[PDB]
Each structure stands twice: as C-alpha cells, then as structure tokens.
Amino acid sequence: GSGPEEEFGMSLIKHNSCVITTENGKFTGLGVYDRFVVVPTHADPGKEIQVDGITTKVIDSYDLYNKNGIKLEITVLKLDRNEKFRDIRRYIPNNEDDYPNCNLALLANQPEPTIINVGDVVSYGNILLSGNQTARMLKYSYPTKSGYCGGVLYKIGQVLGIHVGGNGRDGFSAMLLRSYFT
Numbered sequence: 001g002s003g004p005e006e007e008f009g010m011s012l013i014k015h016n017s018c019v020i021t022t023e024n025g026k027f028t029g030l031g032v033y034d035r036f037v038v039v040p041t042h043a044d045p046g047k048e049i050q051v052d053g054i055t056t057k058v059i060d061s062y063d064l065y066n067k068n069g070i071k072l073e074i075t076v077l078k079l080d081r082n083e084k085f086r087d088i089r090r091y092i093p094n095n096e097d098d099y100p101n102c103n104l105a106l107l108a109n110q111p112e113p114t115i116i117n118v119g120d121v122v123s124y125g126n127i128l129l130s131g132n133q134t135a136r137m138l139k140y141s142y143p144t145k146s147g148y149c150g151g152v153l154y155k156i157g158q159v160l161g162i163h164v165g166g167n168g169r170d171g172f173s174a175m176l177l178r179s180y181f182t
C-alpha cells in the first residue's frame with residue numbers, strides 16, 4: 001500500500017496518535033478529540049504518564065465495560081496538555097460489525113510509523129486475554145507482535161479499534177464505538 005488506505009492511516013498517525021509510556025511500557029495512544037486519548041487498559045496508566053516522552057498529568061481516567069461488567073480493554077484518559085487532537089469521532093462506527101481489508105497503524109515500539117495490512121476483521125465476542133475475560137473483540141488473522149498494543153485498526157474514513165493482544169496467528173482489537181465518546 002502507498003495508496004488511499006495507507007495514506008489515510010499515515011494521516012491518522014500524524015494527527016491522532018502518540019506514544020504513551022506507563023510503568024508497563026510504551027503503547028500507541030489514539031487521540032479521539034481535544035485532550036482525550038484511549039489506550040489499552042492493561043497499560044495501567046497512573047496519575048502521570050508520558051506522551052511522546054513528555055511527562056503529562058492525567059486529569060481523569062476510566063475503564064470501559066460491557067453490559068455484564070466485563071472489561072472492554074479500553075481506558076479513556078483526559079490529559080493535562082495544551083495540544084488538542086483533531087476530532088475523529090465521526091469516523092468511529094455506531095455499531096458492531098465485520099470489516100473487510102483492514103489495516104493497523106502503529107507508532108509505539110516501531111523505528112518509524114508503520115502501516116500493516118491485517119486483512120478481514122470479524123466481530124468475535126468475548127475472549128480470554130492473558131487469562132482475563134475481555135469483551136467486544138475484533139479478530140484478524142495476522143501474526144502481530146508484542147510492541148503492537150494500542151495500534152489503531154482502521155479502514156479509509158473508519159477508526160475501528162485498538163490492538164490489545166494476540167497469539168501469533170490471530171490478533172485482537174478492542175472495538176471503538178461512537179457512543180463511548182459522545
């Protein structure tokens with residue numbers, strides 16, 4: 001890819017991603033709008049994080065759950081920083097769905113911003129990730145790696161999820177739904 005799907009992803013990286021550092025390492029963070037970022041819950045962000053190496057206070061944070069209290073592996077952070085993110089909420093789906101031909105946009109743990117074609121994505125339900133029940137997963141068949149967490153699953157004009165785990169054959173993202181942010 002050097003065409004539109006790659007190009008949309010690179011723009012998404014440049015305008016709406018950052019590297020979030022916690023005590024658990026470096027994660028790709030998705031800036032949703034203004035000072036709101038999402039990161040995988042297992043990043044366990046505290047009261048201070050780094051955003052692109054800059055120590056930043058977390059004004060508030062909260063984890064998301066499904067209807068039965070199962071973690072979604074999404075954590076929302078409101079950051080104490082001057083910069084505002086471009087609002088990408090209109091690109092986030094309203095509903096769960098399957099999606100053909102998706103890409104993953106990676107920033108953290110890569111030598112340079114990286115776009116990967118993960119192929120077709122299905123809404124997979126609940127899984128066990130490192131032994132923990134996790135809900136509203138999107139599954140793709142791609143050999144993801146340890147440094148991919150927080151990577152943004154997308155298609156042109158559609159911001160679909162954030163990468164939270166895998167087993168070497170399959171990769172999983174937490175679904176982004178517009179109602180989480182509105």
Ligand SMILES: *[C@@H](O)[C@@H]1CCC(=O)N2CCC[C@@H]2C(=O)NC[C@H](NC(=O)c2cc(C)on2)C(=O)N[C@@H](Cc2ccc(F)cc2)C(=O)N1
Pocket residue numbers: 042073127128129130131132134143144145146147148149150164165166167168170171
């Ligand atoms: C990013 O922090 C990381 C992404 C890891 C990844 O994509 N990997 C591909 C193969 C090597 C790693 C890996 O270490 N996977 C282990 C585990 N995977 C599973 O449990 C699993 C279940 C099914 C079904 O398919 N894979 C995993 O990915 N763990 C997470 C960390 C995590 C997530 C949620 C929690 F509640 C606790 C811990 C992970 O390592 N993610």
